[PDB]
Amino acid sequence: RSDIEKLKEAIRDTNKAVQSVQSSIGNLIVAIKSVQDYVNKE
Amino acid sequence: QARSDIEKLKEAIRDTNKAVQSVQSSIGNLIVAIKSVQDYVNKEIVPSIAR
Amino acid sequence: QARSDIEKLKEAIRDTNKAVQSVQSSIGNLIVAIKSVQDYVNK
Amino acid sequence: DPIDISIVLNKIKSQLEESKEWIRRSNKILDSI
Amino acid sequence: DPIDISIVLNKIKSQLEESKEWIRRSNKILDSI
Amino acid sequence: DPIDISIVLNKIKSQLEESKEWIRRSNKILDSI
Incomplete structure (x- = not known):
């Protein structure tokens, strides 16, 4: 019961x-997207 | 219950x-996306600058 | 089996x-890679 | 290809969404112990 | 802008260090079984 | 440099391969419970 609680x-x-x-990962998407925008848009 | 809990933990x-x-x-797809930005810079940015 | 299953779960x-x-x-290395790309586009 | 980045990033977003639901289910099983 | 990408990367590094601390605690708990 | 990113991405791929193997091993241990 003690070991069961530890595993939990x-x-x-x-x-x-x-x-x-x-x-x-959500923020890495943001970072990659911004580099492609900077290279595409600006 | 104890067998029940072992099954739940599993x-x-x-x-x-x-x-x-x-x-x-x-992460595999993030590798692909970064690779694509770096390849794009090596393929159509640098040659465009030259032209 | 009880002790056996606990150690397997562990x-x-x-x-x-x-x-x-x-x-x-x-992820740590993906940061380096993104940084590298932006760095090569700035320098 | 501009759209062929877009297809990849959207694959990441869908996989990220699936991952969050698996963790939510794991956590709820833990609550049942 | 590039200086305002740096913010995003710093956010990523901060979450990564939180993730590492959580795994450290999980392994410490397993050491006690 | 173009190859000094290529080294980084190749490291990430092998790290990814290790991660996958670790999850397979966890799942097969679970199969033995």
Whole structure:
């Protein structure tokens, strides 16, 4: 029951890590898009 | 319940793994997108400047 | 089987974490690559 | 090709959306423990 | 502008460092099993 | 330099390959529970 709770919390933290990676990817899209705009528009 | 929880932990990790697999495909496509901007600069920007 | 399954779950999460740590390393390098492209377009 | 970047970025956006839903489901299973 | 791309990259670096701290905690918890 | 980005992108690809292998190994351990 103690080990079960630890595994739960470990997955929960892994999931927070993945959520941070998902926001980082959203911003990488923004960064790439802006470089192509700068090279295309401006 | 204890077997029940072990089964739930397994299915939660399976879902986490599917989230990671999606992130992995996204990163593969980000490689493609950056490659394309760098190739574009090497293919039609620099030659255009020359012309 | 109880102790056996707990240790298997632990190793599964350990391996998932290594997969996330690799993605983290990749993202770090994707920043370098984007920076490099904008840097080569400015210099 | 301008549209052939656009096709790639939209592939990333759809995969990013799928990833968030998987994490949401993982988290809810954890709540059921 | 390029100086205002730098902001986006800094945002990415900040989220990446949060992600690393979360994985660090997860592994520390697993060490205790 | 054009090849000094190409080195970076090739590193990302191999890191991606490692990530995929790690997830496969996690899933197969889950298959043994």
